[PDB]
Amino acid sequence: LHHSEKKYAEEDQVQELLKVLNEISKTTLTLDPRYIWRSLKDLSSLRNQELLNAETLCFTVNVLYPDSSSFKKNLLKFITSNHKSSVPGSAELRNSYPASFYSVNTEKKTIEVTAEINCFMHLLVQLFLWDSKELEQLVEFNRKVVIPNLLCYYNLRSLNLINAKLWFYIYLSHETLARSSEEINSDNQNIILRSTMMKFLKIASLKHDNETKAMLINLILRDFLNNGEVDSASDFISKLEYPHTDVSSSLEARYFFYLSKINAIQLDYSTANEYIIAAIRKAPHNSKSLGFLQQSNKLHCCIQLLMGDIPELSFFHQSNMQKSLLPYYHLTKAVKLGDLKKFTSTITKYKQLLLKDDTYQLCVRLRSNVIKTGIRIISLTYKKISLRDICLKLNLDSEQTVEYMVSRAIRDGVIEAKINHEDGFIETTELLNIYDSEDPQQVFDERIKFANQLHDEYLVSMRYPEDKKTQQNEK
Amino acid sequence: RVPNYEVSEKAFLLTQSKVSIEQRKEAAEFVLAKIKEEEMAPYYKYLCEEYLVNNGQSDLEHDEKSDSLNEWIKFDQELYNELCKKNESKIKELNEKIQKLEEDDEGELEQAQAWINLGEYYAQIGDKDNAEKTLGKSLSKAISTGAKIDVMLTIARLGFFYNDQLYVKEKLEAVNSMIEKGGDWERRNRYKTYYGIHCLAVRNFKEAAKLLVDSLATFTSIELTSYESIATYASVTGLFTLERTDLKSKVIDSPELLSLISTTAALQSISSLTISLYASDYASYFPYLLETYANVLIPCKYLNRHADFFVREMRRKVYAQLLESYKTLSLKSMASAFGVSVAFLDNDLGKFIPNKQLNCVIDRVNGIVETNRPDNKNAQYHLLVKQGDGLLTKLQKYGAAVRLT
Amino acid sequence: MSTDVAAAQAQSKIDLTKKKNEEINKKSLEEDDEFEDFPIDTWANGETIKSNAVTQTNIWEENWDDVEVDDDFTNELKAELDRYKRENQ
Amino acid sequence: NHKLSESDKKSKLISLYLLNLLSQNNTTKFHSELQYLDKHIKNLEDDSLLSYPIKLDRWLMEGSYQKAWDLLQSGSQNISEFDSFTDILKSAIRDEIAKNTELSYDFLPLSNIKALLFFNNEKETEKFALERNWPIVNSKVYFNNQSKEKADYEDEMMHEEDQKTNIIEKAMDYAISIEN
Amino acid sequence: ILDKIFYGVLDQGNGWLYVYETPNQDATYDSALELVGQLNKVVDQLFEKASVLY
């Protein structure tokens, strides 16, 4: 009745698990098991949410577990216990297999290939928590059990890629739990979490398993960003060598996004800009990825205003995000006019929203940038312009004061002018004729190398699957 | 059919209340005469939907605002009753005739044609939903490809009639598909005129120019707003798109524009401006700019979206051409040429210069205007790299996407 | 819901079973969907999204307006005002 | 937090710590510390002296040095131990504007130099000009000499082949990639 | 000058006419704009083909 549903779901898990199990027995493989595993990842979520909650319990009991069943059952008793389908034929069989973990073979103990099955059990329970959307203690129980289970053996290459996804969910529930509410107990537990992250990474270094390391790098960077220890993060990003190999296109997207935040705080607005446009192009378009994309687009707009580049007006209208980016739309206009008065009003008015996204910190820095941007307009519109006239437009107080502002802004060399003190005006030196200079040479040189590197990336990718078709039988 | 386009145009004056007082008054009386006679009562109700607390409202069959400067759109409860009477009676009689034809044999010709006649009655009175369905029956039945084009066009007219651009957009795509299959030139001329006005309502007037020059040479008047307005549309797009020389040869390659002479206020105001740009009159130019705003842009359905857009762009052009021809000017003289004061003149210029579609700078101490636009090898270089950057980007994402899969 | 032109990014990646759950994971990481929280937070439907014609809904090609000033009022005054200074000189 | 970790002394002590970092003249560190203070007290014990180090950072990044000099001037009515970072920050500003004026000017009279470097004594202006290595001869500076030095210093450091970037070398690079 | 029938520019900063008689617009550089123009069309069509792989 209820058992029928559990049994349909159970069989689903087993075929994906059985397939992989054969693959890793021939020699540990990475990307071929990963493809299967990634599809199973989605499946477990859609069945668990929509269909029962002791549906996880049935599979876990049926296989030979090391303690995992005990760990699952505690959670369910609390929310109203289910003990049904722990009866023979659901606690006696270990699920039909040919010999790989077959019921007879396993009970007799000629084999105990519990290994992959144990990893999959961890994934089911962790997913089921996130699907339920419950935090506090349920999270703490998940963290305590699974972390030392995996570290009392040196994982083989194949098992290791599974446990990176386990490290993710533990961390995410913990982080949001701290962001639920300030608690004196939440606070002390974050030091506990911090320690484990870096230790996981060191294991991932030893086996040079590329996707394990990359995923772990993301979590460390996220936690730094939330605690405001960017100082501690500057060092960390300097000692990266990020793999671009076995990764998922989701891993690569997150990575470039994290550099941009750190970069912005280190007043790297130049490399930050490429990195955020890069992150979006790996990242899928979907409503499933929307909260990721939002934060990326907010980050991008602000980066441009800090350059003085000024985002397009177009960016805000054509996106289906106009409400979320609504403050950024008004910031773009504020800097455009050079308006202190508008700008001060915009960032106060929207303060809290900005404060949630942790971009409130970036916005206050734009107060300088209204002044610098104001002066770049003024040097374009007028070749020679009195000191007083400038004061009218930007609501300034003295001639001497605006002279300091321009003096500093052209030390950054944005305005491309030079100040006449003795005559009372500011005279631009812009006249181009830079096609008589050697400048175009440099620019052309860079484009060519980018083109050549695109060839190299065509080479590594194209011929690699060709080889495989000669290897496999299809004649 | 033909009556629709006149009614809408006059109706747009009631939609606005930034237009002239005597003009809006006149337009209300015309619309009311044809509400009685031609059944334009469903579309009169459509006007209040387009408000709900907005000016131009006064309706008493719906929401009122006599605070509005329009108070000549007011409904009557005689009107509400006249609506309901004619609506029901006409649908019932006209339909019964059609039912008989369906009973009788021959559906290839007789029945499809009979269904066209329903969709023309609903087209007339401003029912879009009811027109679409019944002309949906004509298309279902196999007929001439030319007729199918004629019918889609009757439907496309109705989107401008309500002034909903999305409805046109959709429908003119089906016309483009069937225009080649018929291969008729009769309605090829119409299609360009329709599609011209869709391009006019959106910001691409370059396309609009290319379709509407064909419409001068040959005009197809049924179901399409009258030929003096079509001149006014060609002239609008002409000023925006072209520059002196091109503009001059366009309106001498159209004899008809000159021989039609100004015979309506909108045509007069646009044509005065056309001459002065290409003859390089600046003196009387600056007043004509104001006249076009008043008598073309706001009264027109499609250029009322372009009232602020046009005036902003048109000033760039007139300045652009003068500055390109000069290394330097004096500001006071440049102000006099147009007919403004010195200080006033900067303000307009000073929005155009940082967008950098005017490529100049202004000394305020010498009082000279410097022109430092490259027009050499340096300009071609500056343009090219933007495209070549674009090519880099296209390859960066597509490259990644195929390699990962 | 996509950023800028939707079809340009719809072709870049379509539906795949591998990445589908991973799309959720990134969104959950940032914490919210961030398009449905802003209306709750403001506690009324905005009027700053109706700040321009395009900002609420854009079925046009961007004007480059974001300041939207009728320029016929100020020009009319410019013409006449200059005329008077000359006449009373 | 919410058990003797929030303290009166903590608020006072963060105000001073922030000032120490800013006097190092790395704003890079400043913002990173600043991010941490958001999650902690910055709206919970509000800003009224934790406001001061941020306001100062803003007036230097924009480069309004009247507002900056003003704030430090009013930070000398903060006689307890806050007056001890103020002197370092009045010194730093003199150097900042002296870099700026290389770009802005090539000619200043002595009177115009005196105002900009925030000196009230003529001998003090001439004192800095010797040590900063401004050639003020006949009461007029020639900043273009000074730009040459700073540009020349950027070249002198050995990287120098590919910093200049040889015409010949570009073509060679292009060639080998095709023939790889 | 607006025709560019003799090029040159009218200088009323002082009241002169500069008389240029020199080529404007280089042929080679121009056709490179069209070359990029074609390729920007072409990569879209490769991406139409690559929709099979996605």
State the Rg of chain A over Cα.
29
> What is the gyration radius of the CA atoms in chain E, in angstroms?
22
Instruction: Count CA atoms closer than 13 A to B26's CA, side-chain side.
Output: 7
Q: Which of E40, E48, E54 to mutate to test the interface with C (most CBs of C within 10 A)?
A: E54
One DSSP character per residue, A386-424 reads EHHHHHHHHT---HHHHHHHHHHHTTTTSS-EEEETTTT
Do B380 and E30 lie within an 8 Å CB cutoff? yes
Query: What does the block give as tokens for A425?
Result: 């005006």
For chains A and C, CB pairs below 8 A equal 138
Chain E residues in contact with B401 by the CB 8 A cut-off are 50, 54
Interface test with B, best of E9, E22, E48 (most B CBs within 10 A): E9
A377-414 exposure pattern, b = at least 16 Cβ within 10 A, e = fewer: bbbbbbbbbbbeebeebbebeeeeebbbbbbbbbbeeb
Domain that holds residue D14: 1-144
> Both tokens of residue A224?
């730094």
Tokens 């606690």, residue located: A91
Q: Quickly count helices (H) and strands (E) in chain E.
A: 1, 2
DSSP B363: B
DSSP helix/strand/coil, A266? coil
Task: Give the span between the Cα atoms of C26 and A292, in whole angstroms.
Answer: 6
Compute the distance between CA of residue B86 and CA of residue B39 in angstroms, rounded to an integer: 7
In the block, which residue shows the tokens 């001497």? Answer: A400
Q: Closest to A324 (Cβ–Cβ): which among C2, C20, C34?
A: C34
Chains meeting A at 3+ CB pairs closer than 8 A? B, C, D
Between CA C4 and CA A312 the distance in angstroms is: 11
Q: How far is C66 from chain A (nearest CA, A)?
A: 7
How was this structure determined? It was done by cryo-EM
B/C interface, count of CB pairs below 8 Å: 55
Tokens 């939907």 sit at which residue?
B49
Q: Identify the three-state secondary structure at position B321.
A: helix
Record: contact A266-D107, CB cut-off 8 A: no
* Chain D neighbors (3+ CB pairs < 8 Å): A
Please, which residues have CB within 8 angstroms of residue A156's CB and are 6 or more apart in sequence?
A: A28, A115
Residue D153 lies in a domain: no
Residues 6+ apart with CB under 8 A from B356: A380
Is residue B6 within 8 A of residue B54, CB to CB? The reply is no
d(CA A265, CA B4): 62
Is the Cβ of A433 closer than 8 Å to some Cβ of chain B? yes
- DSSP strand pairing (E9-11 vs B326-330): parallel
Closest chain A residue to C35 measured between Cα atoms? A324
| CB-CB neighbors (< 8 A) of E51 in chain C | 11, 14
Q: Is E47 on the interface with C (CB under 8 A)?
A: yes
Cβ contacts of D139 within 8 Å, gap of 6 or more: D109, D110
Specify the DSSP class assigned to residue A287: T
Select from D66, D103, D107 the Cβ nearest to the Cβ of A422.
D107
Residues of D with CB below 8 A from A373's CB? Answer: none
Set of chain C residues whose Cβ sits within 8 Å of the Cβ of A338: none
Name which of E2, E13, E36 is nearest B391 (Cβ-Cβ): E36
- Residue of chain C whose alpha carbon sits nearest to that of A171: C29
User: Radius of gyration over alpha carbons of chain D, in Å?
Assistant: 23
B170, two tokens = 């959709």
10 Å CB burial of residue B185 (0-12, 13-18, 19+) is exposed
Q: How many CB atoms lie within 10 A of CB B11?
A: 26
Chain A contact for C50 (CB, 8 A cutoff): no
CB burial readout D61-89, b (16+ within 10 A) else e? bbbbbbbbbebbeebeebeeebeebbeeb
Q: Which residue of C has its CA nearest to E48?
A: C11
**Under an 8 A CB cutoff, do C13 and E51 touch?**
no
Residues 46-85 of C with CB under 8 A from E: none
Tell me whether residues E9 and B327 touch, CB distance under 8 A.
Answer: yes
Query: What per-residue string of b and e applies to A196-205 under the rule 16 or more CB within 10 Å gives b?
Result: bbeebbebbe
Q: Token match 């533990």: residue?
A: A170
On the CB side of B347, CA atoms within 13 Å amount to: 10
**Cβ contact, residue pair A447, B349, below 8 Å:** no
Q: Hey, are the CB atoms on B354 and A454 less than 8 Å from each other?
A: no
Between the two ends of chain A, the Cα-to-Cα distance in Å is: 48
Closest-CA distance, C82 to chain A, in angstroms, reads 22
Residues facing B369 on adjacent strands? B329, B362
Q: Helix (H, G, I), strand (E, B), or coil: what is residue B370?
A: strand
Residue A216, Cβ density class (10 Å: 0-12 exposed, 13-18 middle, ≥19 buried): buried
Taking alpha carbons only, the member of B329, B235, B161, C51 closest to residue A313 is: C51
Residue A24: strand, helix, or coil? helix
Q: Which chain B positions have a beta carbon within 8 Å of C76's beta carbon?
A: 290
Beta bridge partners of A427: A384, A418
**Token pair belonging to B315:** 């000033």
User: Measured between alpha carbons, how far is A223 from A218 in angstroms, rounded to an integer?
Assistant: 9
Inter-chain CB proximity B378 and A386 less than 8 Å: no
**Domains of chain B by residue range:** 2-325, 326-372
State the DSSP H helix or E strand holding residue E17, giving kind and residue range, or none if neither. strand E16-18
**CB contact set of B119 (below 8 Å; sequence gap of 6+):** B131, B132, B134, B135, B138, B151, B154, B155
CA B53-B307-B25 angle, to 5 degrees, is: 55
- N-terminal to C-terminal alpha carbon distance within chain D: 61
Token digits of residue B78: 């005689």
* CA dist A120 → A63, A104, A159, A216 (Å): 11, 22, 10, 19
Distance, in Å, from the CA atom of D132 to the CA atom of D94, rounded to the nearest integer, reads 10
Four-CA torsion D144, D146, D151, D156, nearest 10 degrees:
140
Minimal CA separation from B92 to chain C, in Å: 39
User: Which residue in A297, A230, B114, B246 sits closest to D33, CA to CA?
Assistant: A230
Alpha-carbon torsion, ordered A56, A58, A60, A62, to 10 deg: -160
- Judged by CB atoms closer than 8 Å, whether chains meet at C14 and E47 is answered as no
- Residues with Cβ within 8 Å of E11's Cβ and at least 6 positions away in sequence, in order, are B326, B327, B328, E17, E18
- Which amino acid appears at position D169 of this protein? E
The pairing of beta strand A384-386 with beta strand B368-371: unpaired
Contact A290 C39 (CB under 8 A): no
**DSSP assignment letter at D5:** S
- For chain C, the distance separating the N- and C-terminal CA atoms, rounded to the nearest angstrom, is 62
Cα separation, B212 vs B231, whole angstroms:
9
Nearest CA in chain C to B335: C82
B13 alpha-carbon distance from chain centroid: 15
Of A32, A10, A11, the residue nearest A23 (C-alpha)? A32
Question: What is the least distance, in Å, from the CA of A116 to any CA of chain D?
Answer: 41
Q: Please tell me if residue C69 touches chain A, with a CB cutoff of 8 Å.
A: no
Question: Which one of B243, B360, B384, B397 makes the best mutation probe of the E interface by having the most chain E beta carbons within 10 Å?
Answer: B384
Residues of chain B contacting residue C75, judged by C-beta atoms under 8 Å apart: 286, 289-290, 311
Is A248 close to C31, i.e. CB distance below 8 A? Answer: no
The verdict on A384 touching B (C-beta cutoff 8 Å) is yes
Contacts of A287 in chain C (CB under 8 A): 1
Is residue D164 in some structural domain?
no
| Structural domain boundaries in chain C | 23-89
One-letter amino acid of A415: I
Query: What span, in angstroms and rounded, lies between the C-alpha atoms of B23 and B26?
Result: 5
**DSSP per position, C18-52:** HHHHHHHHHHHHH-S-SSSHHHHHHTS--SSSSSS
Number of other CB atoms surrounding residue B268 within 10 Å: 18
Contact yes or no for B244 and E13 at CB 8 A: no
Q: Which residues pair with B363 in a beta bridge?
A: A384
Domain count, chain D: 1
C-alpha span between A137 and A189 (Å, rounded): 12
Structure tokens at D50: 């934790």
Only one residue has tokens 């504007």, namely D97
Name the burial class of residue D43, with classes exposed (0-12), middle (13-18) and buried (19+) by CB atoms within 10 angstroms of its CB: exposed
Least CB–CB distance from B398: residue in E24, E32, E46: E46
Instruction: Kindly state whether E22 is in contact with chain B, defined as any CB-CB distance less than 8 angstroms.
Output: no
